[PDB]
Amino acid sequence: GVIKPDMKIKLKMEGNVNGYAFVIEGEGEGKPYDGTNTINLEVKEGAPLPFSYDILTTAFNRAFTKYPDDIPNYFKQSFPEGYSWERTMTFEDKGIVKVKSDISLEEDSFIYEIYLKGENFPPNGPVMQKKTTGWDASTERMYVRDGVLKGDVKHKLLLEGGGYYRVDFKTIYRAKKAVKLPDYHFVDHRIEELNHDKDHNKVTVYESAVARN
């Protein structure tokens, strides 16, 4: 099919957080059937970013998910036409991020066109004060609503000094063709900043994702 065991990634994100504008380009690769992906990110406008890089990482593609044979794969079935997604991240201190991404396929490269807007983050909270220490492992509840796939996460951003900062994810995934719809299932995630430079001008993100009943 069009989804090969090794695939590349190209992305551009236009972002605005608490009114601060920025542009990020990424290049990476992954193993769609293994459910693993790596993206190398460079800030092109707005360096040094004046907020926590953790609020962007989950924006930088469920095509990279390991799926048991018996659970229909909403994402892989969508290609070559691909799919788009829109997401609201609601933070326990009333900060909010809204993301949309178009996922297309050019030969053996996924292409992501991302728009991100964050607002109402407390100026002295851990996002704007860069006091976050990465995402916990998560489980995303995947379920069909109105003919498209919804993903819900009760997520946690770890904090410097210990404990965590609650974030609810609601995502809507919209295939650009008729696909066999899965029953309700789970996707377990682990996302990691593998490395970065002093101001997160250059960041490498890794994610693994596996579907189970």
Amino acid at 192: E
Q: How many CA atoms lie within 13 A of 90 on its CB side?
A: 7
Q: What is the CA radius of gyration of the chain?
A: 16
Name the DSSP letter for residue 181: P
Cα distance between residue 51 and residue 151, in whole Å: 26
DSSP codes of every residue in 7-47: EEEEEEEEEEETTEEEEEEEEEEEETTTTEEEEEEEEEESP
Domain count, the chain: 1
- Check whether the bond before 80 is cis (ω within 30° of 0): yes
Report whether 46 contacts 23 (CB < 8 A): yes
Helix residue spans in the chain (DSSP H): 54-57, 74-77
Biggest CA–CA distance in the chain, Å, is 50
- C-alpha separations of 209 from 9, 137, 139, 145 in Å: 16, 10, 9, 22
Closest alpha carbon to 185 in 139, 154, 137: 139
Query: How many degrees, rounded to 5, is the angle at CA 202 between CA 169 and CA 90?
Result: 15
Resolution in A, one decimal? 1.8
* Beta strands per DSSP E along the chain: 7-17, 20-31, 36-45, 83-91, 96-106, 109-119, 132-135, 138-145, 148-159, 164-175, 185-196, 202-212
SS3 (DSSP) at 76 = helix
φ, ψ for residue 77 (rounded to 5)?
Answer: -60, -30
Cα distance between residue 176 and residue 118, in whole Å: 27
Name the DSSP letter for residue 57: H
| Residue indicated by tokens 């063709």 | 177
Cα distance between residue 134 and residue 53, in whole Å: 9
Q: In terms of residue numbers, what domain contains 11?
A: 1-213
